[PDB]
Design a protein around this ligand. Structure first.
Ligand SMILES: *[C@@H]1O[C@H](CO)[C@@H](O[C@@H]2O[C@H](CO)[C@@H](O)[C@H](O)[C@H]2NC(C)=O)[C@H](O)[C@H]1NC(C)=O
Ligand SMILES: *[C@@H]1O[C@H](CO)[C@@H](O[C@@H]2O[C@H](CO)[C@@H](O)[C@H](O)[C@H]2NC(C)=O)[C@H](O)[C@H]1NC(C)=O
Ligand SMILES: *[C@@H]1O[C@H](CO)[C@@H](O[C@@H]2O[C@H](CO)[C@@H](O)[C@H](O)[C@H]2NC(C)=O)[C@H](O)[C@H]1NC(C)=O
Ligand SMILES: *[C@@H]1O[C@H](CO)[C@@H](O)[C@H](O)[C@H]1NC(C)=O
Ligand SMILES: O=C1NC[C@H](CO)[C@H](O)[C@@H]1O
Ligand SMILES: [Ca+2]
Length: 640
């Protein structure tokens, strides 16, 4: 019936911000080679204040060279004694975010680790000091090379924590003058971190935030008892149609209401990865076509704005928040300066399902809501109004509501799948750029000779590594192949996902079915080394081990194989070939209907080999194991 909003009895918990995740894994892969002005426009919609999603928080993966859901991300230390703070795109992303919002909050978290940290095992807690040293290098690098202050550091994404590691990490941070950096744990479930904090005073002292993943808007008693800030440190992960926006809308409100969570962070920031990779199009917006410049400002952008444009970290929740009588919810916040923001959501069950978890049915129906401002809120008699309807009108500013009544009260008519923001703030704005170019398939003819002397990013565009790491490589001691692409891992990472046994980078249009792929390849390991080119590669990311297609392998022992799978269990053809290590060869692979052929240096090696059909997928390059190899003059012609 009537809902009292008051502050005379005090405030709720401090609000900590809304954010999103770039990483886990390579979710921002295709954003970096967007032409201007589009790339800058995309970033504005994400990070520019009073414009779009206007995010308060940016969380990034600390790359560990392993596969971490939609690709691998390069580490700052591939090997022992190796340090490089200019690989990948998270440095760039954080810097672009900070340019637009100097007050943005920055977080780092590892998914995987380079293999050498394991000292013989696939385990990051073998040498606590070594692993902490690795992580702290990254934070120092952020400051020293990019002028970035990292605000929070996590432990090991959705993986066991080690209490002694967390303590060593704190000691190491302090030792390097990073007392300011806060620790969030354990980016998994509420337990066992929450009970661990109650039982261990020393652990309690060094953990600042309990961050939980996909909590379904609820927390647990031990977490409440801890007295720690509680965050949904990863949520959402749902296709950014209207249903995803509904899910985002509902949990943004009810994570605090039901679970006392004062921050929610969406995976992921922007869908800049091939849509046929796992969890395709699960970003706040979509930007998966750098070749065309086409991007989509999806509904979740404006769902975000309803909170972010009218709240900042450091505001407080009112004690008076809750559910609506006929379904839906409301929250309210103030800044302690006279401002007030009210956020109301009525998302229906059929239009707000998240993937994790799925909620049992709940009813939502039309209703009236009366709000009465008590305490220091009564003195307010003007509120700006912002409105969104899903299923559609987005972030439209309505006529100002007046409370000149003296009643300090007002009433709203609510339907299903709606969002209302009522605020004293006058800075709201539905940011707008002209429409971007229409969607277009990946170019049916495509080439890259990798001839770039001072590349802006460490890897050639559109190549999405799914196991191993591929980089621009300059070799002064060779004129013909001075600038190539090199796979640089020489051992399996401490894995997060199930990385393939072979390295592989995919590129192009997953719809491609008839195609010709050509590349120069160079095997660096004598006797045992091997490389391939491939087409119709149908799976990647977390499922990269499941990839089928047509794979043309050559080996340094003078042999070749044609397989249906990346794992090489299934044979199409095999034989001998004049191939050794440390010599450049040109490979061609043609696939058309039921048949494939392969060429070595322009000369047929095999032809009319029968392959599964119908079938479709990307083109790819790679190496037999985690071994050095180079690639040059890549070309693909394909019919979609
Ligand atoms: C966090 O959780 C809940 C909110 O879901 C709060 O607990 C009580 O909520 C009921 C209504 O749901 C109120 O009538 C009570 O007054 C609340 N408890 C208290 C002590 O005020 C809870 O307060 C929030 N905070 C904590 C520390 O649990
Ligand atoms: C609401 O918030 C705005 C923005 O924070 C407040 O305006 C600021 O007030 C401080 C001092 O309190 C000044 O130093 C800033 O220059 C002001 N900024 C702007 C953009 O006006 C405002 O006082 C708050 N309260 C109300 C009732 O609007
Ligand atoms: C890929 O190539 C196959 C084989 O050439 C094409 O399938 C043939 O298409 C022609 C004309 O469309 C038909 O007359 C044949 O009967 C088809 N053969 C088979 C085995 O299906 C296929 O259409 C091509 N696809 C694309 C997208 O170019
Ligand atoms: C939802 O509530 C309305 C009003 O109480 C009722 O008419 C309707 O049947 C309910 N729907 C379901 C699925 O319970
Ligand atoms: O950490 C994660 N957790 C789950 C996401 C998918 O829902 C994604 O795999 C992400 O990397
Ligand atoms: Ca070259």
């Amino acid at each position: 019936g009537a809902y009292v909003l008051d502050d005379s009895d005090g405030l709720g918990r401090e609000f900590d911000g809304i954010g999103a995740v770039s990483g886990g894994g390579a979710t921002s892969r295709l954003l970096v080679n967007y032409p201007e002005p589009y790339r800058s426009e995309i970033l504005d919609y994400l990070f520019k204040p009073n414009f779009g999603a206007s995010l308060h928080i940016l969380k990034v993966e600390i790359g560990g060279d392993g596969q971490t859901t939609d690709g691998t991300e390069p580490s700052h230390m591939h090997y022992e004694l190796d340090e490089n703070y200019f690989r990948g795109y998270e440095w760039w992303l954080m810097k672009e975010a900070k340019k637009r919002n100097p007050d943005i909050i920055l977080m780092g978290l590892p998914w995987s680790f380079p293999g050498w940290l394991g000292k013989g095992f696939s385990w990051p807690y073998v040498n606590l000091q070594l692993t902490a040293y690795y992580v702290v290098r990254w934070i120092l690098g952020a400051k020293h090379y990019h002028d970035l202050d990292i605000d929070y550091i996590g432990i090991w994404n959705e993986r066991p924590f080690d209490a002694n590691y967390i303590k060593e990490l704190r000691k190491m941070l302090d030792y390097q003058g990073l007392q300011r950096v806060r620790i969030i744990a354990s980016d998994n479930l509420w337990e066992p971190i929450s009970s661990s904090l109650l039982l261990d005073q020393e652990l309690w002292k060094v953990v600042d935030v309990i961050g939980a993943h996909y909590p379904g808007t609820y927390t647990v008693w031990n977490a409440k008892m801890s007295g720690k800030k509680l965050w949904s440190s990863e949520d959402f992960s749902t296709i950014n149609s209207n249903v995803g926006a509904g899910c985002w809308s509902r949990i943004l409100n009810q994570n605090y209401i039901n679970g006392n969570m004062t921050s929610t962070i969406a995976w992921n920031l922007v869908a800049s990865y091939y849509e046929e990779l796992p969890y395709g199009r699960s970003g706040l917006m979509t930007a998966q076509e750098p070749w065309s410049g086409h991007y989509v400002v999806a509904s979740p952008i404006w769902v975000s704005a309803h909170t972010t444009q009218f709240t900042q970290p450091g505001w407080y929740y009112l004690k008076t928040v809750g559910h609506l009588e006929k379904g839906g919810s409301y929250v309210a916040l103030t800044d302690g300066l006279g401002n007030l923001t009210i956020i109301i959501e009525t998302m229906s069950h059929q239009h707000s399902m998240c993937i994790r978890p799925y909620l049992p049915y709940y009813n939502v129906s039309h209703q009236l809501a009366t709000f009465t401002l008590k305490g220091s809120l009564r003195e307010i008699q003007e509120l700006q109004v912002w409105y969104t309807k899903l299923g559609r009108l987005h972030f439209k500013q309505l006529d100002t509501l007046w409370l000149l009544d003296g009643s300090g009260s007002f009433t709203l008519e609510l339907e299903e799948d709606e969002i209302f923001t009522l605020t004293t703030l006058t800075t709201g704005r539905k940011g707008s750029y002209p429409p971007p170019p229409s969607s277009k398939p990946f170019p049916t003819n495509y080439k890259d000779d990798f001839n770039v002397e001072y590349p802006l990013f460490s890897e050639a565009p559109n190549f999405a590594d799914q196991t191993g790491v591929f980089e621009y490589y300059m070799n002064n001691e060779d004129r013909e192949h001075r600038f190539t692409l090199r796979q640089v891992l020489n051992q399996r990472p401490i894995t997060w996902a199930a990385d393939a046994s072979s390295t592989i980078s995919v590129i192009g249009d997953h719809h491609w079915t008839n195609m010709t792929v050509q590349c120069d390849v160079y095997i660096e390991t004598p006797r045992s080394g091997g490389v391939f080119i491939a087409g119709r590669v149908n799976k990647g990311g977390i499922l990269i081990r499941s990839a089928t297609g047509v794979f043309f392998w050559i080996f340094a022992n003078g042999s070749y194989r044609v397989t249906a799978d990346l794992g090489g269990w299934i044979t199409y053809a095999s034989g001998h070939a004049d191939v050794t290590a440390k010599r450049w060869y040109t490979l061609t692979l043609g696939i058309k209907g039921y048949f494939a052929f392969g060429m070595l240096n322009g000369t047929i090696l095999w032809k009319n080999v029968r392959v599964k059909y119908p079938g479709h997928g990307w083109a790819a390059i790679g190496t037999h194991t985690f071994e050095f190899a180079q690639f040059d003059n890549f070309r693909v012609e394909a019919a979609r």
